[PDB]
Design a protein around this ligand. Structure first.
Ligand SMILES: CCCCCCCCCCCCCCCCCC(=O)OC[C@H](COP(=O)([O-])OCC(O)COP(=O)([O-])OC[C@@H](COC(=O)CCCCCCCCCCCCCCCCC)OC(=O)CCCCCCCCCCCCCCCCC)OC(=O)CCCCCCCCCCCCCCCCC
Ligand SMILES: CCCCCCCCCCCCCCCCC[C@@H](O)O[C@H](CO[C@H](O)CCCCCCCCCCCCCCC)COP(=O)(O)OCC[N+](C)(C)C
Lengths: 57, 69
């Protein structure tokens, strides 16, 4: 009582039910380094302007 | 002559104090900026001197025709 599969059937993506737990970290990755914190705050005008040599602004 | 052409000494005195304060603040700011630049270039933990790295959004996280990638 076997029926030969038709065209396009054996190439289907099928779901499979298993009791095997999903691996937590299959890549064996380490802890990623902490990034630079942020750029937080409100922009204020430069103190005494450019401060380049003799320029006052 | 003093009344027509010149002012009192208090004006020049306090203007000199204001100028001195501004210049001293500028000097301390320049030294602080130099130190901050040195530290940021040495460590790289600050906003400055952040050289680009490869964007991780380009990585394709899909099955790769081989289980071991
Ligand atoms: C019409 C004229 C007009 O509208 O005047 C109104 C306008 C308003 O005056 P103000 O802002 O109320 O005056 C502010 C204080 O007087 C003082 O203003 P300040 O302290 O903000 O000065 C502005 C500042 C920066 O401003 C500038 O950079 C412009 C200065 C002109 C360059 C100097 C030589 C070129 C001639 O100047 C400097 O920091 C000095 C550096 C200049 C040296 C340049 C290097 C080499 C010079 C060549 C030798 O006056 C001028 O534009 C001044 C003439 C320039
Ligand atoms: C009773 C007197 C007896 C003796 C007489 C003594 C003669 C002295 C006169 C000679 C004056 C010398 C020139 C020095 C002028 C100083 C310029 C400047 O420093 O003063 C300005 C003051 O402005 C004055 O009005 C200056 C006017 C003088 C202009 C000189 C021009 C003379 C040339 C005449 C040539 C003849 C013309 C005809 C051609 C045929 C400052 O501006 P300002 O920041 O606001 O004032 C600050 C002081 N305040 C606030 C207290 C007022």
């Amino acid at each position: 009582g076997w029926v030969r599969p038709d065209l396009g059937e054996l190439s289907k993506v099928t779901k499979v039910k298993t009791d095997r737990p999903l691996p937590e970290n299959p890549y064996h990755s380490r802890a990623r380094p902490e990034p630079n914190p942020e750029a937080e705050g409100d922009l204020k005008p430069a103190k005494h302007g450019s401060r380049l040599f003799f320029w006052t602004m | 002559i003093a009344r027509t052409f010149y002012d009192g000494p208090e004006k020049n005195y306090e203007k000199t104090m204001a100028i001195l304060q501004i210049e001293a603040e500028k000097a301390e700011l320049r030294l602080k900026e130099l130190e901050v630049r040195r530290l940021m270039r040495a460590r790289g933990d600050g906003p400055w001197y952040q050289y680009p790295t490869i964007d991780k959004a380009l990585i394709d996280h899909s099955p790769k025709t081989t289980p071991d990638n």
